[PDB]
Amino acid sequence: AGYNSEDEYEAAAARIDPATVEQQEHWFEKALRDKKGFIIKQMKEDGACLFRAVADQVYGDQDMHEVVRKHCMDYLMKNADYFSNYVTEDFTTYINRKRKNNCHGNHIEMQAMAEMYNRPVEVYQYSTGTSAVEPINTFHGIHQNEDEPIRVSYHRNIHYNSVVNP
Amino acid sequence: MQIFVKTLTGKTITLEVEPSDTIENVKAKIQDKEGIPPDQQRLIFAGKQLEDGRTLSDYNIQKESTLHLVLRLRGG
């Protein structure tokens, strides 16, 4: 208890139909190919999934998730003066947790990775209301990116995959 | 009175609020300005999470105070 993001945990447990999901995912994937030519790449659904997707985006394989998580946490420590005003825990306590390989990533980590890699992080998400697939968010630093955006997709509001431009 | 909401997404949002406004009201003003759905919004003042049902006065949030906005995006 007392986690920064405690207020997300229960509402995630409540939300949570394999068949309705399965159908939404065909449609998501179709609209993504059809409109952006992007493909969805399946990341393992352990606690590391956000960092798995970033690792796939940055290094080409989700097995580099531990390196990404480590770098992201070092960056957050080095920028604590900024990021600690967005975290309601003791900062060192927060990052200690978040260093653990099964700790789920969140907005704080996505913002840090955008700045740290100097690449915008685009988040894609299926909507039942439209077949549009513009990013729901694009996180970024202030520097001019020389590499393509890091693109992730957010599934069932609880999991991250990799969005590839093939 | 005016307050500021500094988003992790990089925006400074200025709001006109009264001391009796709830945190619920404030998230509604942010949806009006920024389009961010209230159930996605976490609001913080001086390192403390704000709860929907409480008022600005409850938190002693004064004129020209700064709040912080983070989005709910946990994934595993």
The CATH number of the domain holding residue A52 is 3.90.70.80
Amino acid making up residue A95 = I
d(CA A63, CA A46): 12
Task: Give the max Cα distance, chain B.
Answer: 40
Helix (H, G, I), strand (E, B) or coil at A155: strand
Residue A160 domain-assigned (yes or no): yes
Packing angle between helix A91-98 and helix A65-78, nearest 10 degrees? 170
DSSP β-bridge partners for residue A155: A159
d(CA A27, CA A12): 23
From residue A148, how far is each of A129, B3, B7 by CA, in Å? 29, 36, 24
DSSP β-bridge partners for residue B6: B12, B68
Q: Which of A74, A107, A140, A159 is catalytic?
A: A159
Residue A10 domain-assigned (yes or no): no
Residue A114 domain-assigned (yes or no): yes
Residue B49: burial class (beta carbons within 10 Å; 0-12, 13-18, 19+): middle
Task: Please say if A46 is a catalytic residue.
Answer: yes
CATH 3.40.50.720 fits B1-75, yes or no: no
Query: Phi-psi bin for A156: left (phi > 0), alpha (psi -120 to 50), beta?
Result: left
Residue A52 domain-assigned (yes or no): yes
Q: Which helix (H) or strand (E) holds B62?
A: none
In chain A the first and final C-alpha atoms are separated, in Å, by 42
Residue A5 domain-assigned (yes or no): no
* Cα-Cα-Cα-Cα dihedral sign, residues A106, A67, A63, A35: positive
CB-nearest to B8 from A111, A155, A157 is: A111
Q: Which of B59, B43, B55, B62 is nearest to B5 (CA)?
A: B43
Range of the domain at A155: 17-166
Residue A3 domain-assigned (yes or no): no
d(CA B76, CA B70): 18
Beta strands in B20-60 (DSSP E): 41-45, 48-49
- Tokens standing for residue B38: 């209230």
- Taking contacts as CB-CB distances below 8 angstroms, the residues of chain A near B44 are 85-86, 88
Domain count, chain A: 1
d(CA B38, CA B40): 5
Residue A7 domain-assigned (yes or no): no
Residue A8 domain-assigned (yes or no): no
Strand order in the sheet with B41-45: B12-16, B2-7, B66-71, B41-45, B48-49
Strand order in the sheet with A137-139: A39-41, A159-164, A150-155, A121-124, A137-139
From residue B59, how far is each of B26, B39, B70 by CA, in Å? 13, 20, 18
Beta strands in A58-158 (DSSP E): 121-124, 137-139, 150-155
Q: How was this structure determined?
A: X-ray
CB-nearest to B74 from A106, A123, A140 is: A106
Asked if B76 lies within 8 A of A47 by C-beta distance, the reply is yes
